[PDB]
Amino acid sequence: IFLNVLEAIEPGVVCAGHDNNQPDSFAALLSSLNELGERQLVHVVKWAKALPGFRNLHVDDQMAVIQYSLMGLMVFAMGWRSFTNVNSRMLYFAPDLVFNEYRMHKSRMYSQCVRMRHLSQEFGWLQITPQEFLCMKALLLFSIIPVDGLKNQKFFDELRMNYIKELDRIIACSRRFYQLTKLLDSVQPIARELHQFTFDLLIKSHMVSVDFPEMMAEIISVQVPKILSGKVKPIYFH
Ligand SMILES: C[C@](O)(COc1ccc(F)cc1)C(=O)Nc1ccc([N+](=O)[O-])c(C(F)(F)F)c1
Numbered sequence: 001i002f003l004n005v006l007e008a009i010e011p012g013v014v015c016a017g018h019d020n021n022q023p024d025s026f027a028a029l030l031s032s033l034n035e036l037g038e039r040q041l042v043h044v045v046k047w048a049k050a051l052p053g054f055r056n057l058h059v060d061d062q063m064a065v066i067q068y069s070l071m072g073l074m075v076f077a078m079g080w081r082s083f084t085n086v087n088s089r090m091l092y093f094a095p096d097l098v099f100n101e102y103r104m105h106k107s108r109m110y111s112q113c114v115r116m117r118h119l120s121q122e123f124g125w126l127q128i129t130p131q132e133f134l135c136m137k138a139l140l141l142f143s144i145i146p147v148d149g150l151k152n153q154k155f156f157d158e159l160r161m162n163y164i165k166e167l168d169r170i171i172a173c174s175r176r177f178y179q180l181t182k183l184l185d186s187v188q189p190i191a192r193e194l195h196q197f198t199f200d201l202l203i204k205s206h207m208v209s210v211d212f213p214e215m216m217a218e219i220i221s222v223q224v225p226k227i228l229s230g231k232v233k234p235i236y237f238h
Pocket residue numbers: 030033034035036037040067070071073074075076077078079092093094116194198216219220
C-alpha cells in the first residue's frame with residue numbers, strides 16, 4: 001500500500017524551457033535554473049500534500065516543511081535522474097537543461113555540481129532500488145526543522161518515525177540502513193552549499209541580470225536565511 005502510493009504520486013517530467021539553441025551564458029543558465037525551480041516547486045507541493053499522513057501536520061507546518069526541505073528534495077531527485085538517464089555522465093536537471101562540465105563551470109556552481117554528480121554515482125555504486133529511492137525521498141521532506149519548533153512538533157515527529165519504519169520494511173538489514181542513512185545525510189551539505197550560492201545570487205541578482213520567479217524569491221529571502229543563520233537545521237542520522 002505505502003509503496004503503491006509513493007509510485008502513484010511521483011512527479012512526471014518537468015522542463016526548464018531553456019534555449020539550448022544559443023551559446024551558454026551565466027545569465028541564461030541561471031535564469032533557467034530559477035525558472036525550473038519555480039516549476040518544480042509547483043510539483044513538489046502537490047506531491048508532498050498527497051503523501052501518506054502529510055495532512056496530519058498542522059496547516060502552517062505543511063508549507064514550512066516543504067519550503068525548508070525543497071532544495072534537498074530537488075537535489076536528491078536530480079541525482080537520481082542523472083543516474084538513470086545518463087549514467088551520471090552529466091547532471092540531468094531537466095530534459096532540456098543537462099549540465100556537462102563546461103556548463104557546471106559556466107554556472108559558477110561547479111563545486112556543488114561535482115558533489116551532486118558524486119551523489120548520482122552513489123545511486124549506482126550502492127545499487128539503490130527505485131523503491132528505496134522513493135522512500136528515501138519522502139523521508140527527506142521530514143528531515144529539517146526549526147529550533148524553536150513547529151506549531152505541532154509531535155505530529156511531525158510521529159510522521160517522521162513512521163516513514164523511517166517504512167524504510168525499515170523496504171530494507172527487510174543493519175548494513176543497508178547504515179548505507180542509506182549515510183547517503184541521506186550527504187544531501188544536506190550539498191543543499192546548504194546551493195542555499196548559500198542562491199542566497200548570494202539573489203542579493204546581487206540586479207547586477208548579473210538574473211531573473212528570480214516570485215515564489216523562489218520569497219523562499220530564498222524568507223526561509224533560506226533561517227537555515228543559513230542556524231534557526232532551521234537538518235536532522236542528521238549520524
Ligand atoms: C539557483 C536555483 O535556481 C535556486 O533554486 C532554489 C531551489 C530551492 C530553494 F529552496 C531555493 C532556490 C537552483 O538551484 N535551481 C535548481 C533547479 C533545478 C534543480 N534540480 O532539478 O534538481 C536544482 C538542484 F536541486 F539540482 F540543485 C536546482
